[PDB]
């Protein structure tokens, strides 16, 4: 239970929560905007995963201001969570290499 692994776990949990809330809130923001496609929850959940991973195929996206604000929160949550996982991996590798050198 080192700090970086704990923060990775917390980040994963928070990211899942952000995906669920982002899905629900994107549907709430986008309904009422003619032409909007991000308007049912299953595909909104798929879109939130797309957005958080940055693997944005372009099949779905928000057209409203509040839908795009929701999108930005999902983007930042995903990108920073994955950066935090990378940082935790770096810390683990650094510690293990320090032990391997006997420092």
């Amino acid at each position, epitope marked *: 239970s080192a700090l970086h692994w704990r923060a990775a776990g917390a980040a994963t949990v928070l990211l899942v929560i952000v995906l669920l809330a982002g899905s*629900y809130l994107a*549907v709430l923001a*986008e309904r*009422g905007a*003619p*032409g*909007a*496609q991000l*308007i*049912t929850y299953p595909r909104a959940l798929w879109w939130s995963v797309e957005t958080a991973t940055t693997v944005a195929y372009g099949d779905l996206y928000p057209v409203t201001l509040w839908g795009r604000c929701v999108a930005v929160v999902v983007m930042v949550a995903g990108i920073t969570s994955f950066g935090l996982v990378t940082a935790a991996l770096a810390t683990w590798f650094v510690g293990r290499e320090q032990e391997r050198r006997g420092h």
Partner: antibody
Amino acid sequence: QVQLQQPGAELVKPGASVKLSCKASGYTFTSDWIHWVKQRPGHGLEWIGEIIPSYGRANYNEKIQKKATLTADKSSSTAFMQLSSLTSEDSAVYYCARERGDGYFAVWGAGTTVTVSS
Amino acid sequence: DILLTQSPAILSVSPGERVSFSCRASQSIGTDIHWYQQRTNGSPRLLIKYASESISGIPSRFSGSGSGTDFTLSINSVESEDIANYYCQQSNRWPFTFGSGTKLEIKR
């Protein structure tokens, strides 16, 4: 059990208003949307609007003259549609329908026949 | 706003035959089309969701097909209880819209 309960009929004088109700039973989810659909005698189905009761936000058909105002009471699982200042063009059966946020109307109420007449 | 064209507006068929209702979307909408039956003085009843998915309690004579702009509701072996108006409805873009309906008639 019947999932959506609507009164059978409402008589409204021209110019007056009426509040239709739709009491829901069965499974209730935060993702539930309640929709309202107008059907004039011998005509098709016309979407009026929707409301998400867990948040109270309502959206309306932009193509038609706005005569409805949608509200919901979460404590009694009942959705209301206030139709305001009616003419005979507003005489119709008004259905409510429940959509689980996945785009289709899984269940419909029996419909309230609204007659606008003196 | 997506226009759903249902034509012909009336279909006449002999008992026991296969019948197909057409629904055409003004733009491509994947499989986000749902089909409802409304009998005289009745409420609409969902028959088929997402173009081809069965609904519990609906007779297996009902099926659906198509994707993009062209969709078909089919009844294998029409019988009298199938006399009704049939409506398609799209959920691909806001607002949800309905087709204008096709009436099924049986030549007995």
